[PDB]
Each structure stands twice: as structure tokens, then as C-alpha cells.
Design a binder for this molecule. Structure first.
Ligand code: CL
Ligand code: CL
Ligand code: CL
Ligand code: CL
Ligand code: NA
Length: 129
């Protein structure tokens, strides 16, 4: 599913991401925009053989099982295919663990490089939230 910007912000707020671990909602919508263009079905292969999955491009080396990343963990305890559902529950729950891992949303390189330090509130401007 390809989410609308305000549509995603609302689903994200309902699932408890607004200021989760101190990160305002616009950070999460920004991250989704540049990770996946709001597409739940986005997948991307990494150089190390792992793959990023879903709206927030969660990686198979640490967070989900896809059966093809040797020596990897499944810390969110889910198949990576769950991260591609039009229901973003799996992705949000896993992102809560990821953002809690020590480095905040720096875990998302696209957030560090494209969202961090910017006016992220722009990503939720105009939405009925
Ligand atoms: Cl915000
Ligand atoms: Cl694996
Ligand atoms: Cl949802
Ligand atoms: Cl932090
Ligand atoms: Na894995």
C-alpha cells in the first residue's frame, strides 16, 4: 500500500509513534518518505546481503527473518514479509524496538542524512491529526 502523507501520519499517531522515545511525529513521516516513499511494499537489498523491508526499511541482519541473511538475528520476532503489510502494526512495533536500541533514529541513515536537523513538522503540516 502507498500511504498518503497525512494518512500515514494518522496511522503512525494511532500506533503510538508521536514522540515515542522523544521523536515527534514529523520525524517518523520524514523517515518513511525517504526510506520508502510511503510504500509498505518497498524492499531493497543491502551490500552485506541483508534486505530492508517496508515503510521504514527495516533490515534483516538484525530485526526480522527472511530466511536468507546468514548469521542474522530476528530481534523483532517476525518474518520480514510482515513488514510489507498494508497494516503498519508490525513495522511500528519493530521500529519502537529499533529506536530504543541506543542510537535513536540515527539507526535510519536516511533520517540522519535527510530529516535530522530539518523542519520535520513540515511533514505533518495541514493534516487533521
Ligand atoms: Cl513534528
Ligand atoms: Cl536468515
Ligand atoms: Cl495501519
Ligand atoms: Cl535519542
Ligand atoms: Na534476520
Amino acid at each position: 500500500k502507498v500511504f498518503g502523507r497525512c494518512e500515514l501520519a494518522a496511522a503512525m499517531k494511532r500506533h503510538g509513534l508521536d514522540n515515542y522515545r522523544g521523536y515527534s511525529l514529523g520525524n517518523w513521516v520524514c523517515a518513511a518518505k525517504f526510506e520508502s516513499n510511503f510504500n509498505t511494499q518497498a524492499t531493497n537489498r543491502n551490500t552485506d546481503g541483508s534486505t530492508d523491508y517496508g515503510i521504514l526499511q527495516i533490515n534483516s541482519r538484525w530485526w526480522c527473518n527472511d530466511g536468507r541473511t546468514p548469521g542474522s538475528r530476528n530481534l523483532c520476532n517476525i518474518p520480514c514479509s510482515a513488514l510489507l503489510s498494508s497494516d503498519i502494526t508490525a513495522s511500528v512495533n519493530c521500529a519502537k524496538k529499533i529506536v530504543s536500541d541506543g542510537n535513536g533514529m540515527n539507526a535510519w541513515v536516511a533520517w540522519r542524512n535527510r530529516c535530522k536537523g530539518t523542519d520535520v513538522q513540515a511533514w505533518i503540516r495541514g493534516c487533521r491529526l
